[PDB]
Amino acid sequence: RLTPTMMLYSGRSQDGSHLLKSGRYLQQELPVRIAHRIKGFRSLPFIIGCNPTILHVHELYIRAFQKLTDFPPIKDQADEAQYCQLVRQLLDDHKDVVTLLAEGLRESRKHIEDEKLVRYFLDKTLTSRLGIRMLATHHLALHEDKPDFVGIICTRLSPKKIIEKWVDFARRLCEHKYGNAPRVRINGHVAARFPFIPMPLDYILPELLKNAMRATMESHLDTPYNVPDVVITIANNDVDLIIRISDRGGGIAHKDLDRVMDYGFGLPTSRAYAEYLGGSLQLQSLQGIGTDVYLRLRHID
Amino acid sequence: RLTPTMMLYSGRSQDGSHLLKSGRYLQQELPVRIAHRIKGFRSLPFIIGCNPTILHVHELYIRAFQKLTDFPPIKDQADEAQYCQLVRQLLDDHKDVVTLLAEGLRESRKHIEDEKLVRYFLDKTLTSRLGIRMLATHHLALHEDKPDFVGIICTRLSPKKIIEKWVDFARRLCEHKYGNAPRVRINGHVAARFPFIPMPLDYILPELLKNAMRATMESHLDTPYNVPDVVITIANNDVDLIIRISDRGGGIAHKDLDRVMDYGFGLPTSRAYAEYLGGSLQLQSLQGIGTDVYLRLRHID
Ligand SMILES: O=C(O)CCCc1ccccc1
Ligand SMILES: O=C(O)CCCc1ccccc1
């Protein structure tokens, strides 16, 4: 049910009176959360906030906020229904945002004086963005009749099965560039099943696997046909879920340790999403051997 | 040669004129470093600093400082020689100190109001103590004719060989209580050899192995004859040395995470020695599976 500063509705109605309360809530919350993001764009240093791409994303939000406010209060099913259509448009229009931001800010490196100030902007924007798209997709999900799912929430989610999905996805991206990809072994609580929201995992994991596999391959150019396995370990307790990802790609060099976590661009975002959801994302480099990555995600309650 | 706030002499003389400079330095430095420790005892909260055991250790230092100052300047070989005899007495008299402290402070738990204040006292005392005993033993070591050793410094130290020593030591302590002990496998840079000082390792390692083995055994009471291996990984680069110690003893429970690193009593001391020498000691608990421990030690220069 609950989430940081927001609620994901666990409710059921044969007549769909839950979709009213859900949408009624969404229409109260969404505009507020968007507005907070607009203050954040306004607070940007002039020099940066002026860069056209940043300025475009800035506009997108103003547009979204207009559209949401303009939409009239929901008093019946048909309202809610057409509301869903908006949320769909919005989700599609903002789908490339994180990319735009990245380039908006890449163009804008030189004029960057205070780093902490932007890293904060990004964290607050990218994560606050997540929460929005989660809350939105949860709602749309309430219309689906999918089994084992209350909204976007799995009732019986297997960490193993979902890691495997992202593995095949990552193996493929990888094989294509290097001709091979490291075998991936998974141990620990591989039979674990429990209520959870795939969405966060759906961003983060392919990030970590892409790295694990990239580093592994990049360090064995001589023997791409025989590379050390990527070892994933799952630990499920009553507090949170840990997923450790071990690679043997010589680890992140000492100098790069600072630079790697700061905003190639995928780890800092993953750390942010993790912290946002009451979890974390820690690194252990073993220079000369490999890297171990620890992702913790709080259990839902 | 160098060390934090102190120098370990790399020098050679057929006539032993190095033992003069060495001792001349020791006799300048030792009294200063002891005096700093006495200010630390004086700064203790009255209530604690009054506890007889703390008071005894307090006295020991005053005694040591007397003895060192009283000893007359070294102008010849025979001076230095009898100086060595003092340092030997001192090293023996202060050998049980860390234990005394621990009990001095255990008796004194109730009257503890500011924790950070004592944890700091301990870190500064135990580590500053290390440096003293290192500097002292280095000197005495300069008299030995041992090959591959300049003082207490190994010229060709194998992390593997030294871990193995502490493993056999830990296996034994362990087998005695549980009847078995986990096999220990070592990977990574197992052929690494390089200049180093065994001493720090000689404290720390048996600590970590004792834990790795304790946890492993304590979690497999049903099958002590078949327990998951302890996996040690060595990573040697040009900056520092990493030793990772992985166990499968279900890890440190969430609640205990805070308590475990604070002053059973062996980890906090190990973290302190590590930091002191420009290294660190990090933990990764995987609740339900095990713990991974990362020890970094700067390379000598
Ligand atoms: O996703 C973003 O970039 C910002 C959110 C846009 C949006 C709002 C409400 C519902 C759906 C989407
Ligand atoms: O070891 C301690 O507890 C404090 C050091 C005592 C000592 C001083 C000089 C040389 C040898 C020993």
XYZ file of C-alpha atoms and ligand atoms in Angstrom:
626
model
C 0.000 0.000 0.000
C 2.413 2.722 1.145
C 5.435 4.378 -0.522
C 7.654 7.417 0.295
C 5.398 10.515 0.546
C 2.749 8.686 -1.504
C 0.218 5.842 -1.450
C -0.247 2.887 -3.828
C -3.854 1.716 -3.423
C -4.527 -1.882 -2.473
C -8.268 -2.068 -3.062
C -10.874 -4.099 -4.926
C -14.374 -3.350 -6.161
C -16.567 -5.437 -8.449
C -18.152 -2.173 -9.612
C -14.813 -0.371 -9.904
C -15.447 2.253 -7.230
C -11.739 1.895 -6.421
C -10.827 3.451 -9.777
C -12.688 6.560 -8.623
C -10.847 6.957 -5.325
C -7.606 6.078 -7.146
C -8.099 8.720 -9.878
C -9.548 11.248 -7.435
C -6.286 10.874 -5.509
C -4.072 10.975 -8.567
C -5.703 14.209 -9.734
C -5.062 15.783 -6.307
C -1.454 14.520 -6.019
C -0.043 14.672 -9.591
C -0.376 18.444 -10.021
C 1.304 19.067 -6.693
C 4.252 16.779 -7.491
C 4.667 18.336 -10.932
C 4.608 21.840 -9.431
C 7.439 20.961 -7.048
C 9.436 19.967 -10.132
C 8.787 23.320 -11.739
C 10.115 25.198 -8.681
C 13.198 22.997 -9.098
C 13.648 24.094 -12.698
C 13.186 27.721 -11.638
C 15.803 27.393 -8.934
C 18.417 26.295 -11.472
C 21.311 28.680 -12.057
C 20.227 31.008 -14.876
C 23.157 29.993 -17.099
C 22.139 26.328 -17.078
C 18.356 26.756 -16.863
C 18.711 28.712 -20.126
C 20.218 25.881 -22.149
C 17.555 24.960 -24.740
C 17.209 21.265 -23.822
C 16.865 22.072 -20.118
C 14.508 24.797 -21.213
C 12.544 22.253 -23.260
C 12.163 19.826 -20.340
C 11.194 22.866 -18.280
C 8.445 23.579 -20.817
C 7.251 19.946 -20.873
C 6.552 20.134 -17.159
C 4.667 23.426 -17.464
C 2.675 21.788 -20.237
C 1.996 18.690 -18.130
C 0.894 20.808 -15.174
C -1.434 22.822 -17.379
C -3.019 19.659 -18.835
C -3.528 18.118 -15.350
C -5.109 21.180 -13.783
C -7.215 21.897 -16.839
C -8.635 18.386 -16.599
C -11.988 18.679 -14.741
C -12.747 16.960 -11.411
C -13.717 13.292 -11.743
C -17.292 12.540 -10.682
C -17.947 9.420 -12.775
C -16.460 6.433 -14.611
C -16.172 8.137 -17.991
C -14.174 10.992 -16.483
C -11.668 8.629 -14.908
C -11.536 6.784 -18.231
C -10.522 9.832 -20.276
C -8.205 10.853 -17.451
C -6.402 7.564 -18.064
C -5.925 8.669 -21.660
C -4.157 11.839 -20.503
C -1.828 9.985 -18.145
C -0.999 7.716 -21.099
C -0.158 10.740 -23.282
C 1.886 12.253 -20.486
C 3.862 9.059 -19.800
C 4.740 8.831 -23.507
C 5.666 12.526 -23.805
C 7.985 12.447 -20.828
C 9.568 9.074 -21.598
C 12.802 10.487 -23.068
C 13.194 13.119 -20.305
C 16.152 11.589 -18.435
C 18.009 11.597 -21.739
C 17.216 15.220 -22.519
C 18.373 16.186 -19.059
C 21.690 14.394 -19.498
C 22.441 16.251 -22.747
C 20.986 19.503 -21.527
C 23.574 19.230 -18.771
C 26.411 17.839 -20.926
C 26.207 20.912 -23.172
C 26.303 22.862 -19.938
C 29.408 21.430 -18.172
C 31.624 24.528 -18.477
C 29.224 26.876 -16.702
C 28.975 24.427 -13.813
C 30.460 26.004 -10.681
C 28.679 24.224 -7.811
C 28.452 20.486 -8.499
C 26.593 19.404 -5.380
C 23.873 21.871 -6.465
C 23.126 20.133 -9.769
C 23.650 16.550 -8.534
C 20.954 17.433 -6.038
C 18.731 18.807 -8.797
C 19.113 15.607 -10.737
C 18.472 13.315 -7.794
C 15.387 15.191 -6.784
C 14.066 15.400 -10.348
C 14.841 11.862 -11.563
C 13.535 10.228 -8.402
C 10.563 12.494 -7.960
C 9.904 11.632 -11.607
C 9.989 7.941 -10.759
C 7.410 8.272 -8.019
C 5.135 10.143 -10.424
C 5.428 7.516 -13.160
C 4.971 4.763 -10.615
C 1.832 6.269 -9.184
C 0.506 6.852 -12.695
C 1.285 3.369 -14.003
C -0.144 1.823 -10.854
C -3.438 3.530 -11.639
C -3.545 2.439 -15.280
C -2.548 -1.036 -14.040
C -5.690 -1.204 -11.856
C -7.684 -1.616 -15.106
C -5.736 -4.712 -16.205
C -7.079 -8.106 -15.126
C -3.607 -9.646 -14.691
C -3.257 -12.428 -12.044
C -0.741 -12.014 -9.204
C -0.888 -8.239 -9.680
C -2.629 -5.560 -7.637
C -1.781 -2.640 -9.894
C 1.948 -2.655 -10.588
C 2.453 -4.644 -7.405
C 3.301 -8.323 -7.786
C 1.811 -10.481 -5.011
C 4.223 -13.382 -5.705
C 7.362 -11.846 -7.257
C 10.465 -13.995 -7.805
C 13.738 -12.017 -7.650
C 15.329 -14.858 -9.594
C 12.852 -14.866 -12.474
C 13.108 -11.062 -12.864
C 16.915 -11.002 -12.711
C 16.917 -13.685 -15.399
C 14.808 -11.482 -17.657
C 17.320 -8.661 -17.350
C 20.206 -11.064 -17.790
C 18.964 -12.305 -21.194
C 18.411 -8.708 -22.165
C 21.918 -7.766 -21.058
C 23.549 -10.879 -22.525
C 22.060 -9.917 -25.888
C 23.160 -6.265 -25.885
C 26.552 -7.668 -24.874
C 27.019 -10.602 -27.278
C 26.272 -8.148 -30.113
C 29.295 -5.947 -29.304
C 31.846 -8.418 -27.993
C 30.647 -11.579 -29.675
C 30.270 -13.246 -26.294
C 28.874 -12.459 -22.840
C 29.776 -13.811 -19.356
C 27.690 -16.687 -18.030
C 25.599 -15.446 -15.121
C 25.184 -17.602 -12.010
C 22.649 -16.841 -9.320
C 22.794 -18.134 -5.727
C 21.359 -17.420 -2.261
C 17.556 -17.348 -1.864
C 16.681 -18.302 -5.411
C 13.263 -19.699 -4.488
C 12.244 -16.491 -2.682
C 8.795 -15.151 -3.594
C 7.073 -12.108 -2.051
C 4.975 -8.943 -2.665
C 6.957 -6.321 -4.558
C 6.985 -3.704 -7.319
C 8.982 -4.745 -10.387
C 9.277 -1.151 -11.635
C 12.362 0.046 -9.698
C 14.149 -3.259 -10.392
C 13.205 -2.740 -14.073
C 15.400 0.407 -14.230
C 18.299 -0.522 -11.941
C 19.132 -4.176 -12.816
C 19.869 -3.738 -16.536
C 22.184 -0.951 -15.436
C 24.223 -3.075 -13.072
C 24.276 -6.091 -15.454
C 25.402 -3.853 -18.330
C 28.335 -2.769 -16.185
C 29.163 -6.198 -14.802
C 29.247 -7.516 -18.366
C 30.978 -4.515 -19.933
C 33.832 -4.563 -17.373
C 34.159 -8.356 -17.664
C 34.396 -8.200 -21.431
C 36.598 -5.068 -21.594
C 39.218 -6.796 -19.446
C 39.266 -10.073 -21.390
C 39.779 -8.945 -24.984
C 42.244 -11.792 -25.480
C 39.724 -14.486 -24.509
C 36.151 -13.270 -25.114
C 35.178 -16.913 -25.585
C 36.206 -17.634 -21.996
C 35.349 -14.997 -19.448
C 34.785 -15.203 -15.667
C 31.142 -15.582 -14.667
C 29.040 -12.822 -13.181
C 27.781 -14.037 -9.855
C 24.524 -12.746 -8.488
C 23.520 -13.401 -4.931
C 20.042 -12.912 -3.546
C 19.422 -12.440 0.146
C 15.855 -12.220 1.383
C 15.102 -11.277 5.005
C 12.073 -9.676 6.708
C 13.539 -6.175 6.510
C 14.793 -5.799 2.937
C 16.068 -7.598 -0.149
C 19.708 -7.639 -1.086
C 21.072 -8.384 -4.490
C 24.813 -8.576 -4.826
C 26.418 -8.446 -8.264
C 29.991 -9.641 -8.523
C 32.165 -9.215 -11.596
C 35.804 -10.042 -12.340
C 36.591 -7.135 -14.632
C 39.511 -5.710 -12.642
C 37.332 -3.252 -10.732
C 37.023 0.521 -10.835
C 40.470 2.140 -10.685
C 41.249 4.322 -7.681
C 41.122 7.670 -9.512
C 37.779 6.817 -11.161
C 36.159 5.847 -7.845
C 34.975 9.396 -7.168
C 34.035 10.182 -10.789
C 32.195 6.875 -11.384
C 29.338 7.517 -8.953
C 28.907 11.178 -9.928
C 27.021 12.057 -13.123
C 28.345 6.185 -17.867
C 25.570 8.149 -16.096
C 23.682 4.992 -15.074
C 25.053 4.226 -11.616
C 24.287 7.567 -9.995
C 20.692 7.322 -11.171
C 20.443 3.793 -9.807
C 21.821 4.867 -6.432
C 19.194 7.617 -6.359
C 16.229 5.379 -7.137
C 17.492 2.912 -4.510
C 17.806 5.547 -1.753
C 14.461 7.069 -2.701
C 12.705 3.739 -2.043
C 14.383 3.357 1.346
C 17.180 1.178 0.064
C 20.713 1.835 -1.031
C 23.358 1.009 -3.604
C 26.932 0.411 -2.402
C 30.184 -0.439 -4.294
C 33.238 -2.447 -3.431
C 36.062 -2.156 -5.928
C 38.919 -4.632 -5.722
C 41.471 -2.997 -7.957
C 43.124 -5.681 -10.083
C 40.334 -8.233 -9.692
C 36.747 -6.966 -9.946
C 33.792 -5.141 -8.422
C 30.975 -6.150 -6.121
C 27.736 -4.158 -6.174
C 25.190 -4.221 -3.399
C 21.629 -3.212 -3.969
C 19.233 -3.128 -1.014
C 15.501 -2.471 -1.382
C 13.186 -2.148 1.587
C 10.339 -4.682 1.744
C 6.829 -3.312 1.291
C 4.544 -2.720 4.280
C 60.650 3.963 5.392
C 57.728 6.240 6.297
C 54.591 5.712 8.427
C 51.828 8.015 9.801
C 53.492 10.739 11.938
C 56.555 8.495 12.317
C 59.529 6.987 10.479
C 60.666 3.353 10.154
C 64.382 3.443 9.305
C 65.598 1.712 6.170
C 69.347 1.819 6.726
C 72.390 -0.444 6.829
C 75.787 -0.177 8.481
C 78.464 -2.844 8.818
C 79.540 -1.105 12.033
C 75.969 -0.630 13.260
C 75.948 3.170 13.221
C 72.311 2.842 12.130
C 71.384 1.434 15.547
C 72.592 4.725 17.018
C 70.481 6.979 14.807
C 67.578 4.539 15.267
C 67.800 4.565 19.093
C 68.614 8.277 19.210
C 65.337 8.793 17.342
C 63.361 6.352 19.440
C 64.488 8.076 22.641
C 63.343 11.448 21.243
C 59.997 10.145 19.902
C 58.837 7.520 22.460
C 58.543 9.907 25.416
C 56.549 12.367 23.353
C 54.105 9.708 22.121
C 53.672 8.326 25.635
C 53.019 11.824 27.005
C 50.220 12.381 24.490
C 48.649 9.196 25.860
C 48.821 10.527 29.388
C 46.975 13.734 28.416
C 44.356 11.378 26.964
C 43.979 9.559 30.268
C 43.732 12.904 32.068
C 41.026 14.106 29.722
C 38.827 11.122 30.586
C 35.613 11.877 32.459
C 36.476 11.725 36.170
C 33.931 8.964 36.844
C 35.562 6.600 34.350
C 39.190 7.701 34.763
C 38.734 6.733 38.430
C 37.886 3.091 37.799
C 40.845 1.106 39.198
C 41.758 -0.771 35.994
C 41.694 2.429 33.934
C 43.617 3.974 36.781
C 46.131 1.115 36.612
C 46.717 1.522 32.863
C 46.998 5.242 33.575
C 49.755 4.448 36.080
C 51.560 2.083 33.675
C 51.951 4.919 31.202
C 53.256 7.328 33.844
C 55.692 4.599 34.827
C 56.745 4.025 31.213
C 57.253 7.748 30.653
C 59.348 8.020 33.796
C 61.554 5.075 32.747
C 62.073 6.516 29.220
C 62.987 10.013 30.344
C 65.148 8.750 33.176
C 67.133 6.715 30.662
C 70.245 8.792 29.776
C 71.052 10.042 26.253
C 72.662 7.422 24.006
C 76.228 8.255 22.978
C 77.559 4.737 22.348
C 76.744 1.120 21.476
C 76.406 -0.095 25.056
C 73.844 2.599 25.824
C 71.678 1.616 22.876
C 72.103 -2.005 23.957
C 70.726 -1.480 27.468
C 68.073 0.798 25.997
C 66.913 -2.232 24.018
C 66.508 -4.047 27.322
C 64.142 -1.339 28.576
C 62.006 -1.392 25.436
C 61.794 -5.172 25.909
C 60.600 -4.729 29.514
C 58.133 -2.082 28.424
C 56.694 -4.172 25.571
C 56.133 -7.063 27.999
C 54.607 -4.855 30.718
C 52.131 -3.238 28.371
C 51.213 -6.399 26.462
C 47.896 -6.996 28.266
C 46.861 -3.307 28.096
C 44.086 -3.581 25.485
C 42.495 -6.197 27.720
C 42.703 -4.077 30.856
C 41.155 -1.196 28.973
C 38.237 -3.324 27.805
C 37.408 -4.420 31.366
C 38.189 -1.054 32.860
C 35.498 0.227 30.518
C 33.104 -2.733 30.889
C 32.934 -2.118 34.647
C 32.273 1.475 33.686
C 29.345 1.170 31.208
C 26.654 2.734 33.425
C 28.481 6.019 33.961
C 28.943 6.367 30.210
C 26.991 9.389 28.965
C 28.844 10.454 25.801
C 29.761 7.409 23.707
C 31.554 9.148 20.857
C 33.877 10.581 23.542
C 35.145 7.199 24.746
C 35.161 5.472 21.333
C 37.480 8.290 20.355
C 39.623 7.711 23.441
C 39.938 4.064 22.572
C 40.755 4.626 18.919
C 43.390 7.170 19.722
C 44.905 5.063 22.508
C 44.841 1.617 20.858
C 46.182 2.905 17.555
C 48.678 5.305 19.027
C 49.733 2.280 21.080
C 50.227 0.283 17.899
C 52.510 2.866 16.354
C 54.592 2.890 19.535
C 54.952 -0.896 19.641
C 55.696 -0.965 15.939
C 58.418 1.624 16.188
C 59.869 -0.185 19.196
C 59.797 -3.657 17.651
C 61.245 -2.296 14.426
C 64.243 -1.084 16.408
C 64.794 -4.360 18.258
C 64.327 -6.091 14.883
C 67.288 -4.145 13.429
C 69.549 -6.350 15.605
C 68.248 -9.609 14.097
C 70.077 -10.991 11.059
C 66.901 -12.362 9.430
C 66.850 -12.519 5.578
C 64.106 -10.688 3.658
C 63.632 -8.363 6.637
C 64.735 -4.773 7.165
C 63.557 -4.455 10.750
C 59.945 -5.593 10.972
C 59.567 -4.852 7.277
C 59.397 -7.827 4.928
C 61.036 -7.142 1.549
C 59.218 -10.063 -0.145
C 55.978 -10.615 1.810
C 53.340 -13.031 0.487
C 49.772 -12.110 1.520
C 48.838 -15.718 0.820
C 51.476 -17.300 3.046
C 50.595 -14.965 5.955
C 46.834 -15.474 5.618
C 47.486 -19.215 5.671
C 49.338 -18.887 8.967
C 46.361 -17.141 10.533
C 43.971 -19.621 8.970
C 45.647 -22.640 10.627
C 45.638 -20.714 13.864
C 41.951 -19.893 13.480
C 40.991 -23.365 12.246
C 42.526 -24.778 15.423
C 40.814 -22.421 17.885
C 37.652 -23.281 15.946
C 37.871 -27.080 15.589
C 38.382 -27.214 19.375
C 34.974 -25.639 20.115
C 32.802 -26.889 17.277
C 34.646 -30.056 16.364
C 35.064 -28.799 12.815
C 36.055 -25.605 10.993
C 35.156 -24.278 7.499
C 37.608 -24.999 4.698
C 39.242 -21.749 3.632
C 39.801 -21.014 -0.063
C 41.969 -18.174 -1.276
C 41.796 -16.599 -4.753
C 42.836 -13.441 -6.630
C 46.532 -12.457 -6.595
C 47.808 -15.440 -4.662
C 51.342 -15.180 -6.053
C 51.660 -11.512 -5.038
C 54.882 -10.617 -3.208
C 55.939 -7.125 -2.071
C 57.496 -4.984 0.719
C 55.231 -4.816 3.756
C 54.946 -4.919 7.548
C 53.382 -8.126 8.874
C 52.560 -6.540 12.247
C 49.185 -4.890 11.478
C 48.050 -7.986 9.547
C 49.148 -10.023 12.604
C 46.459 -8.319 14.751
C 43.609 -7.873 12.264
C 43.484 -11.173 10.287
C 42.948 -13.584 13.197
C 40.115 -11.276 14.187
C 38.310 -11.463 10.875
C 38.948 -15.232 10.475
C 37.659 -15.869 14.007
C 34.439 -14.127 13.021
C 34.119 -15.698 9.587
C 34.517 -19.111 11.210
C 32.409 -18.409 14.297
C 29.433 -17.154 12.232
C 29.788 -20.056 9.777
C 29.795 -22.611 12.560
C 27.101 -20.922 14.700
C 24.674 -21.083 11.777
C 25.330 -24.729 10.882
C 24.886 -26.533 14.199
C 22.992 -29.288 12.396
C 25.865 -30.054 10.007
C 29.207 -29.011 11.538
C 30.826 -31.709 9.408
C 29.686 -29.891 6.269
C 29.892 -26.132 6.345
C 30.214 -23.546 3.540
C 33.787 -22.485 2.819
C 35.270 -19.164 3.828
C 36.481 -17.478 0.695
C 39.361 -15.064 0.847
C 40.208 -12.872 -2.079
C 43.443 -10.966 -2.481
C 43.709 -7.960 -4.748
C 47.087 -6.330 -5.225
C 47.407 -3.022 -7.103
C 49.986 -0.197 -6.991
C 47.955 1.852 -4.517
C 46.911 -0.590 -1.792
C 46.188 -4.212 -0.929
C 42.685 -5.521 -0.546
C 41.715 -8.645 1.271
C 38.097 -9.659 1.112
C 36.742 -12.239 3.546
C 33.457 -13.869 2.646
C 31.464 -16.087 4.984
C 28.085 -17.810 4.682
C 26.973 -17.515 8.288
C 23.716 -15.641 7.650
C 25.297 -12.222 8.151
C 24.956 -9.612 10.873
C 21.280 -8.974 11.648
C 19.924 -5.498 10.965
C 19.601 -4.416 14.612
C 23.148 -5.581 15.434
C 24.673 -3.669 12.505
C 25.175 -0.520 14.574
C 26.219 -2.330 17.776
C 28.640 -4.731 16.029
C 31.164 -2.098 14.941
C 31.024 -0.151 18.217
C 32.952 -1.437 21.246
C 33.001 -9.059 20.454
C 35.262 -5.979 20.753
C 37.590 -7.141 17.959
C 36.131 -5.505 14.858
C 36.192 -1.916 16.079
C 39.849 -2.284 17.003
C 40.606 -3.752 13.590
C 38.828 -0.892 11.829
C 40.929 1.530 13.877
C 44.282 -0.059 13.085
C 43.282 -0.169 9.402
C 42.323 3.532 9.244
C 45.414 4.511 11.217
C 47.667 2.952 8.553
C 45.844 4.754 5.747
C 43.565 1.861 4.948
C 40.058 0.946 5.938
C 37.784 -1.877 7.014
C 34.291 -2.075 5.486
C 31.377 -4.546 6.016
C 28.663 -5.873 3.785
C 26.015 -7.896 5.572
C 23.621 -9.972 3.498
C 20.991 -10.829 6.053
C 19.980 -14.464 5.586
C 23.135 -15.488 3.728
C 26.457 -14.163 5.046
C 28.938 -11.320 5.437
C 31.716 -9.935 3.290
C 34.557 -8.024 4.944
C 36.874 -5.696 3.098
C 40.238 -4.775 4.460
C 42.368 -2.245 2.576
C 45.946 -1.399 3.561
C 47.955 1.293 1.828
C 51.179 0.128 0.155
C 54.421 1.374 1.680
C 56.353 4.261 0.119
O 7.569 11.495 -16.325
C 8.000 12.667 -16.258
O 9.031 13.049 -16.861
C 7.241 13.664 -15.415
C 5.819 13.171 -15.190
C 4.857 13.492 -16.342
C 3.615 12.737 -15.952
C 2.757 13.268 -14.998
C 1.624 12.565 -14.605
C 1.360 11.320 -15.158
C 2.231 10.787 -16.109
C 3.363 11.486 -16.503
O 52.385 -0.696 24.521
C 51.754 0.093 25.258
O 50.719 -0.238 25.882
C 52.268 1.506 25.404
C 53.734 1.565 25.000
C 54.705 1.153 26.115
C 56.028 1.112 25.398
C 56.713 2.294 25.148
C 57.919 2.274 24.458
C 58.432 1.067 24.005
C 57.737 -0.117 24.252
C 56.531 -0.099 24.940
